[PDB]
Write an enzyme that holds these catalytic residues in place. Sequence first.
Site, PDB file in Angstrom:
ATOM      1  N   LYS A  36     -51.185  42.800   5.049  1.00 39.82           N
ATOM      2  CA  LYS A  36     -51.003  43.263   6.417  1.00 39.82           C
ATOM      3  C   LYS A  36     -52.286  43.914   6.915  1.00 39.82           C
ATOM      4  CE  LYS A  36     -47.740  45.675   9.385  1.00 39.82           C
ATOM      5  NZ  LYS A  36     -46.400  46.331   9.418  1.00 39.82           N
ATOM      6  N   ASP A 130     -35.605  52.561   9.363  1.00 43.08           N
ATOM      7  CA  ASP A 130     -35.514  51.569  10.429  1.00 43.08           C
ATOM      8  C   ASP A 130     -34.747  50.358   9.911  1.00 43.08           C
ATOM      9  OD1 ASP A 130     -35.851  49.826  12.562  1.00 43.08           O
ATOM     10  OD2 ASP A 130     -37.940  50.414  12.902  1.00 43.08           O
ATOM     11  N   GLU A 134     -34.614  43.162  13.685  1.00 43.51           N
ATOM     12  CA  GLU A 134     -35.990  42.719  13.869  1.00 43.51           C
ATOM     13  C   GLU A 134     -36.963  43.352  12.883  1.00 43.51           C
ATOM     14  OE1 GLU A 134     -33.952  44.316  16.125  1.00 43.51           O
ATOM     15  OE2 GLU A 134     -35.180  45.283  17.667  1.00 43.51           O
ATOM     16  N   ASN A 135     -36.566  44.411  12.179  1.00 46.39           N
ATOM     17  CA  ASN A 135     -37.449  45.075  11.230  1.00 46.39           C
ATOM     18  C   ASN A 135     -36.968  44.942   9.793  1.00 46.39           C
ATOM     19  OD1 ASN A 135     -39.022  45.865  13.422  1.00 46.39           O
ATOM     20  ND2 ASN A 135     -37.978  47.840  13.626  1.00 46.39           N
TER      21      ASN A 135
HETATM   22  C1  LIG Z   1     -45.525  43.113  11.244  1.00 46.22           C
HETATM   23  O1  LIG Z   1     -45.279  43.529   9.921  1.00 46.22           O
HETATM   24  C2  LIG Z   1     -44.511  42.626   9.181  1.00 46.22           C
HETATM   25  C3  LIG Z   1     -44.707  43.029   7.717  1.00 46.22           C
HETATM   26  O2  LIG Z   1     -45.039  44.170   7.435  1.00 46.22           O
HETATM   27  N1  LIG Z   1     -44.509  42.109   6.754  1.00 46.22           N
HETATM   28  C4  LIG Z   1     -44.661  42.357   5.316  1.00 46.22           C
HETATM   29  C5  LIG Z   1     -44.076  41.108   4.777  1.00 46.22           C
HETATM   30  N2  LIG Z   1     -43.754  40.599   3.590  1.00 46.22           N
HETATM   31  N3  LIG Z   1     -43.231  39.369   3.719  1.00 46.22           N
HETATM   32  C6  LIG Z   1     -43.225  39.099   5.016  1.00 46.22           C
HETATM   33  N4  LIG Z   1     -42.735  37.898   5.542  1.00 46.22           N
HETATM   34  C7  LIG Z   1     -42.914  37.345   6.778  1.00 46.22           C
HETATM   35  O3  LIG Z   1     -43.587  37.860   7.649  1.00 46.22           O
HETATM   36  C8  LIG Z   1     -42.245  36.045   7.036  1.00 46.22           C
HETATM   37  C9  LIG Z   1     -42.064  35.525   8.317  1.00 46.22           C
HETATM   38  C10 LIG Z   1     -41.437  34.314   8.528  1.00 46.22           C
HETATM   39  C11 LIG Z   1     -40.943  33.542   7.457  1.00 46.22           C
HETATM   40  N5  LIG Z   1     -40.318  32.335   7.681  1.00 46.22           N
HETATM   41  C12 LIG Z   1     -39.679  32.121   8.981  1.00 46.22           C
HETATM   42  C13 LIG Z   1     -38.279  31.511   8.954  1.00 46.22           C
HETATM   43  N6  LIG Z   1     -37.712  31.214   7.656  1.00 46.22           N
HETATM   44  C14 LIG Z   1     -36.488  30.442   7.708  1.00 46.22           C
HETATM   45  C15 LIG Z   1     -38.742  30.603   6.854  1.00 46.22           C
HETATM   46  C16 LIG Z   1     -39.882  31.553   6.530  1.00 46.22           C
HETATM   47  C17 LIG Z   1     -41.126  34.077   6.163  1.00 46.22           C
HETATM   48  C18 LIG Z   1     -41.756  35.293   5.969  1.00 46.22           C
HETATM   49  C19 LIG Z   1     -43.758  40.194   5.737  1.00 46.22           C
HETATM   50  C20 LIG Z   1     -44.102  40.728   7.087  1.00 46.22           C
HETATM   51  C21 LIG Z   1     -43.041  42.697   9.553  1.00 46.22           C
HETATM   52  C22 LIG Z   1     -42.429  41.654  10.234  1.00 46.22           C
HETATM   53  C23 LIG Z   1     -41.081  41.725  10.572  1.00 46.22           C
HETATM   54  C24 LIG Z   1     -40.341  42.846  10.226  1.00 46.22           C
HETATM   55  C25 LIG Z   1     -40.951  43.895   9.544  1.00 46.22           C
HETATM   56  C26 LIG Z   1     -42.294  43.824   9.210  1.00 46.22           C
END
Ligand SMILES: CO[C@@H](C(=O)N1Cc2[nH]nc(NC(=O)c3ccc(N4CCN(C)CC4)cc3)c2C1)c1ccccc1
Lengths: 256, 92
Positions: A36, A130, A134-135
């Site tokens: 990140k 939180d 969404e988080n």
């Molecule tokens: C902005 O920070 C990130 C953060 O810190 N992070 C740390 C962290 N660790 N792993 C993460 N994974 C993803 O961002 C992600 C997004 C989409 C994804 N796909 C989309 C749909 N799926 C069916 C297939 C795979 C798979 C993984 C994140 C984000 C965050 C994002 C959302 C909520 C909380 C934090």
Amino acid sequence: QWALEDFEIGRPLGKGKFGNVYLAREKQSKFILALKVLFKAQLEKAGVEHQLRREVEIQSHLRHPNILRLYGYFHDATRVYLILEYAPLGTVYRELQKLSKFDEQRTATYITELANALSYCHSKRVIHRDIKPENLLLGSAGELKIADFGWSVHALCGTLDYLPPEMIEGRMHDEKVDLWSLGVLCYEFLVGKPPFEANTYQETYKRISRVEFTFPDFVTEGARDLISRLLKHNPSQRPMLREVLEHPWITANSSK
Amino acid sequence: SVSSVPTKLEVVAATPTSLLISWDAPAVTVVHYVITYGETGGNSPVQEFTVPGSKSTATISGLKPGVDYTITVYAIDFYWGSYSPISINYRT
Ligand SMILES: CO[C@@H](C(=O)N1Cc2[nH]nc(NC(=O)c3ccc(N4CCN(C)CC4)cc3)c2C1)c1ccccc1
């Protein structure tokens, strides 16, 4: 220990408010992690650099299967980096958009996972996590992962919809705020939208302060019972997390 | 390993016993710079002093004439700690 040179930066997983999040591999073992990035100039312009510095220390101590691991952090001239656990299934928000709403088995399992994580946090005297959809991220087995740092997540705000009455009036609060949040989330999982949603701030404030909400006809009596036990105006009347984990509707429907 | 703060450290003027060093500051605010120097032979002890982050130059004095020295400078971020160092060599 952990430094930038230890990671090969892969594809972007998504963009945050202050920078992107990348899939990453530790060079020596190819272990998959998430990197990140938060730009310092953006942190300072938003006035959240101090907040980030404090919260990376806080999160680094939280070890729980339903809390996203923060393994370390470093920086260079223009960026702060966080080495985070990789949650491959994305946010539960996107799952909720896809399914419109979750069935009771899926919901009760999620609630169990969060009640476990929140009980662990409370044992560390850390409160008000939180847990907006969404988080919340999802692990490889579909299990929830609390992320916090919600101010760093790119989206109206969902914060208001989850705040208990004592927080919207800016009064002193305790660990019972997480019980209220759990009830708000259980409703949103089952219904597809939070219970106090309204088109203005004053209207939403009024609904929360009066705990004015209704159930759709399909919400079962057990789910109504749990949600209503959690959405108490008086925080001391909200149940213990152990009572949530042992609630009849939870134990009948949770796979955990 | 890939970056350092400051960058482009250099000796811009010298006497037989002193060095005037200069470096490029980053955009972000720096608390102060840590400056170390000693005989390159590795036997003599390393001397260290600090210089406020508002400065981009410093004087190293009390040096021996005709001796190889290694000079190292790294900045300090208020929140995130020290940066990676940058080193140069100079023969007085
Ligand atoms: C902005 O920070 C990130 C953060 O810190 N992070 C740390 C962290 N660790 N792993 C993460 N994974 C993803 O961002 C992600 C997004 C989409 C994804 N796909 C989309 C749909 N799926 C069916 C297939 C795979 C798979 C993984 C994140 C984000 C965050 C994002 C959302 C909520 C909380 C934090």
